Amino acid sequence: QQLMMILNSASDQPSENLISYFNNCTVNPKESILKRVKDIGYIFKEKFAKAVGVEIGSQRYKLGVRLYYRVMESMLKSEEERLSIQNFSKLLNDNIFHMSLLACALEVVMATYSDLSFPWILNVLNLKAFDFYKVIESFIKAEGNLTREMIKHLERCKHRIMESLAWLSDSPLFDLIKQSNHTAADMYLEPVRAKSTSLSLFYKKVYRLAYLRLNTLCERLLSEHPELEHIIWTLFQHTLQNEYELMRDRHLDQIMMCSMYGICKVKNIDLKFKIIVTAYKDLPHAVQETFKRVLIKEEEYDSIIVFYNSVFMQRLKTNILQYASTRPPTLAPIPHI
């Protein structure tokens, strides 16, 4: 609420201190920013009215712009001490950065006055999910006045990217994988020419997420053999690392479910899919469609079992059978607290 009243009384264009920073740039970007704001405003108002039968669409967008500008300033204030004069100015003239900061401010506004739910704004601004991921944490950390529910929303936005949206085809994440600290500005200053801080942070966070979800379902379902959780994590984590094609257009929680059934299957452990798959519904934001509609190949979808036997097993039979031999694979590290 407080932030929402700083914005209503605030201004639709940059503070003077924010312009101080524009005056610290070699290529004064301010011209480019104002143009970006207006051209985006045009596309935003269209797609806005296009879905809800302007007046509201214009006012949503201006609050975002006030939030966009407030956070940029705060963000630039940390980045003074971190970036060279050259990197500072490259940031302020970087399209994908500014697109992502504004898209994140706008999502805040949209979801406060809340389907139009995320990722609508990323389809509005044609902004790749993986690009947007780079801004979220630094955004939360640059706006001390986000409410709890709202932080929860950005984090939910963040987690859906980690679990699916970054794994969509044509998503740049796959281009970054093939070639194989951590502020939003660091990740946007990455070039598009051939190690990626962006990929390293994403995979690191994904592993902590993916494991914590594994841990929950393993304690409920594998308390009879607490020995299986670390083995299942090994299959899961090996799969995310070296068989990353399996995640393409699929869901992190789908790979988690196959791994637990797979490991229990080669351990001759009686734990059927539906026994765990019913337990997955009891995860916080879980959906039934996650195990009811699973991609096989060329746009053909089916249950998770059809995915298990017809795609998952076909691709991992060589790895999975090592876990029951006299020379099982070495166990993968647990992601750090």
Residue numbers in the entry: 383 to 435, 439 to 499, 511 to 576, 599 to 612, 643 to 785
Copy text from the publication.
The retinoblastoma tumor suppressor (Rb) is a multifunctional protein that primarily regulates the cell cycle but also has roles in cellular differentiation, DNA damage response, and apoptosis. Essential functions of Rb occur through its pocket domain, which is necessary for regulating binding interactions with E2F transcription factors and transcription repressors that bind via an LxCxE motif. The pocket domain is the most highly conserved region of the multidomain protein, as well as the most frequent site of mutations. Protein X-ray crystallography of four missense variants reveals how mutations destabilize the protein fold and inhibit E2FTD or LxCxE binding.
For E554K and E533K, we sought to understand the structural basis for large reductions in RbP-E2F1TD binding as well as substantial decreases in thermostability. The significance of E554 in Rb-E2FTD binding was initially pointed out by the authors of the two RbP-E2FTD structures as forming an H-bond the phenolic hydroxyl of conserved tyrosine in E2F1TD and E2F2TD. Remarkably, the crystal structure of E533K shows something similar in which the mutated lysine sidechain creates a salt bridge triad with E554 and E551 in a manner that occludes the Y411(E2F1TD)-binding pocket. Together, the variant structures of E533K and E554K reveal a structural basis for the disruption of E2FTD binding. However, from these structures alone, it is not clear how the mutations induce fold destabilization. In the structures of RbP-E2F2TD RbP-E2F1TD, both E554 and E533 form A/B subdomain-spanning salt bridges to K653. It is possible that the loss of the salt bridge interactions contributes to the large destabilization effects observed for these variants. Within the cyclin fold of subdomain A, the greatest destabilizing effects (ΔTm) are caused by E554K (−7.0 ± 0.5 °C), E533K (−6.4 ± 0.5 °C), E492Q (−5.4 ± 0.8 °C), A490V (−5.1 ± 0.6 °C), K462E (−5.0 ± 0.5 °C), E539D (−4.9 ± 0.5 °C), A490T (−4.7 ± 1.0 °C), and A488V (−4.1 ± 0.6 °C).
